[PDB]
Structure formats: structure tokens, C-alpha cells
Write a protein that binds this ligand. Structure first.
Ligand code: NA
Length: 373
């Protein structure tokens, strides 16, 4: 994870060449309807338009500075669009941290147009150096790179199927298996017969069906139910960030440039934290970090998410932590409030407000109550 910086410098060099010298990508939207209004303006644009310098305005607002309005628009919109409320994404029943495409998104008939729009926004976020709070699986990113799903990819995705397919490959399954190139799935209460290739009444045999069976099955199973959604998303993304520019990246590296690091370094966090109304040596600050040191990786992910809106950190580390309009370091603000109160976050400012709790144990417990659930 060391030449990734150099890959990313090459990419952002080549993309700045992509930006036209003249013209702007103008957007004007209300804060209250940022998703729908951005959607309408952005989908009127040609891919060329999306590479232009951003010139953004919130309806009814003058705005301090264009650069700052633009960061804020990108931050807020990329935050909303990933919200299950809009119907495009959901968290896995299998894991409420993994983001996935909503397979029922078609209840909105224009759904594919919204997937295309989100793709474009993700592309513009990479183009302008912004990290989205992106919870997608690694095979999702490899699909974005134009790479085939592998049997290894099934370990997380479908762990029983993984075992089944590994067994098929590693053993002479002649006779026992008795399957064809037609796979069955229950969709919406109904059993669907899906042929993996023309005439899928070819029985699976050793005799070199089987390797092709597994490769077709695996690529079918990953995007199963979400093929059209994914395709539109990928198309929006690559209108902004052409696939040829990404040819030296693998899925792990793409994930890192899109949403940052999921491994939280507590030393980097500590060293890049600002203090308000509490000093480096005070109890509340000592106790906060003691709790963080005890917190496991899920608890740290929940804390980071609580305070900042995301559970991941910029590649550049905590010194690059993002507020709504530009860099804002993680901040602990000690407040004059009742000590029965929980910590309160302001995610726009990566700030946590902490009452003057009377012991570590009290701080520890109130902090856990705030971040679990
Ligand atoms: Na934030």
C-alpha cells in the first residue's frame, strides 16, 4: 500500500489534462432538495461538461466562496445519494455496514437514470479528490474496473456457494452432482430457471464443463437481480473517469481512492485532533482516548461514523479529515451540559460535544450508549 500514492498522482495528473481550459459546470440547487435537483441538472449534461471547473450556488444563498460551496455540494449530495431513503442502496441484512444496490429499485421506473446519475457523482468525487462514505464490497469495485468476478470473490458474497463451487472444481463430481447449466433462484416468491449459456441443458461434467460452469455461475451470482442498476452506475462513473485511466489499479486500490481507509490508526487520530474548552492534560481528554484505545475496530468505526458521518479516513490520514466545506480536524469540545447527557456530534464539523463526566467509567459508558444501535 505504498505505490498507491504514485498511481493516484498519475491519475489526478491525467485527469487535470482532461479538464477543459474554458467553461464551468454550473449547478444551482436548494439544500433541501439537493438530490432531486442535482439529478435533473447533472443528467442534462454531456460527459465533457462534468470535467469542467465547478461553479455552484445554493438557491437563495450568496455563498462565501465558490470553492467552498462546491466542496459542500459534493459532500452533501454524495452523502444523501447513498442514503437508503432514496431507494438506490440498502445495507445488507447480512451486515449493516456493507452498502449494496437495492434489488427492488425498479419501483421507481426511472431508477436506471438515477444509478447513472450516482455513477457520475462518484466519478466527480474521485475527479475532485473527495472521499464518499462508501460501503460497497470489493467485487463491486472490481466490476467498476471491468474485471471478472472470481470464485475467491464468493467467500464473502455467498459462503455456502463458495464451498459448493470449490468442491466441484477440486473433486470428480461425475454422477453425484447431477446439475445442468440452468441455475434456479427464488425471486419475489417465484422459482426462476436461469440458463447460464445457450441451451443450458448441457449437464455439468468434469470433462471440462465444470470450470466454465463455475466462472459463469460466479459472475451470474454476484450481480444477480442488480445487473441493470450496476451497468448504469458503472456507465455514469466511467463517463467521468475512463476505464483506461484505471488499468493499473486493482479493486483494493480503487476502493481506497473512492472511500479511504477502513483501518483506523489511533495515533494518527490522536495527533490530528483539536481541543475546545479542554486541555491536552485534562481528564475528559485522557478518558476519551482511554476509551478509544479499549474500543475494538467495530466500536471505533461506530465512533468515527457518529462524529463525522463516515467510518473511513482519507488516504492522507486524519490531518485530511473532511468537514462539509473543506478540511476540519476531529474536534473534542467540552460543553457545559448536564452529565446525564450523551455526547452530541456535529458531523459537518467532525466535532463531538462532551459534558464534564465525573469518571472514566461514566465517559466510557455514555460514549458507548451514544454510538451503539
Ligand atoms: Na464530516
Amino acid at each position: 500500500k505504498r505505490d498507491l500514492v504514485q498511481k493516484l498522482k498519475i491519475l489526478r495528473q491525467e485527469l487535470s489534462q482532461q479538464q477543459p481550459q474554458a467553461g464551468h459546470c454550473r449547478i444551482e440547487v436548494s439544500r433541501e432538495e439537493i438530490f432531486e435537483e442535482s439529478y435533473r441538472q447533472v443528467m442534462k449534461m454531456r460527459p465533457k461538461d462534468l470535467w469542467k471547473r465547478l461553479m455552484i450556488k445554493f438557491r437563495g444563498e450568496e455563498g462565501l466562496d465558490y470553492g467552498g460551496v462546491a466542496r459542500e455540494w459534493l459532500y452533501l449530495l454524495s452523502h444523501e445519494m447513498l442514503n437508503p431513503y432514496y431507494g438506490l442502496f440498502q445495507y445488507s441484512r447480512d451486515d449493516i455496514y456493507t452498502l449494496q444496490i437495492n434489488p427492488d429499485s425498479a419501483v421507481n421506473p426511472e431508477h436506471l437514470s438515477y444509478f447513472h446519475f450516482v455513477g457520475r457523482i462518484m466519478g466527480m468525487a474521485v475527479f475532485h479528490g473527495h472521499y464518499i462514505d462508501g460501503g460497497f464490497t470489493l467485487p463491486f469495485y472490481k466490476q467498476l474496473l471491468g474485471k471478472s468476478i472470481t470464485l475467491d470473490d464468493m467467500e464473502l458474497v455467498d459462503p455456502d456457494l463458495h464451498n459448493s463451487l470449490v468442491w466441484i472444481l477440486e473433486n470428480d463430481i461425475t454422477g453425484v452432482l447431477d446439475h445442468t447449466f440452468c441455475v434456479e433462484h427464488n425471486a419475489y416468491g417465484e422459482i426462476i430457471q436461469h440458463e447460464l449459456k445457450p441451451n443450458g441443458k448441457s449437464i455439468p461434467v468434469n470433462e471440462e464443463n465444470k470450470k466454465e460452469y463455475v466462472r459463469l455461475y460466479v459472475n451470474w451470482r454476484f450481480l444477480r437481480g442488480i445487473e441493470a442498476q450496476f451497468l448504469a452506475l458503472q456507465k455514469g462513473f466511467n463517463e467521468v473517469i475512463p476505464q483506461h485511466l484505471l488499468k493499473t489499479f486493482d479493486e483494493k486500490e480503487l476502493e481506497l481512492i473512492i472511500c479511504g481507509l477502513g483501518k483506523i490508526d489511533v495515533n494518527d487520530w490522536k495527533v490530528n485532533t483539536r481541543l475546545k474548552h479542554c486541555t491536552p492534560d485534562s481528564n475528559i481528554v485522557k478518558w476519551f482516548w482511554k476509551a478509544v484505545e479499549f474500543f475494538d475496530e467495530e466500536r471505533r468505526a461506530r465512533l468515527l461514523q457518529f462524529v463525522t458521518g463516515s467510518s473511513r479516513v482519507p488516504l492522507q490520514g486524519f490531518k485530511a479529515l473532511q468537514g462539509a466545506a473543506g478540511p476540519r480536524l476531529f474536534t473534542i469540545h467540552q460543553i457545559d451540559a448536564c452529565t446525564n447527557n450523551l455526547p452530541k456530534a456535529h458531523t459537518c464539523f467532525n466535532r463531538i460535544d462532551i459534558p464534564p463526566y465525573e469518571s472514566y467509567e461514566k465517559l466510557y459508558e455514555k460514549l458507548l450508549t451514544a454510538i451503539e444501535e
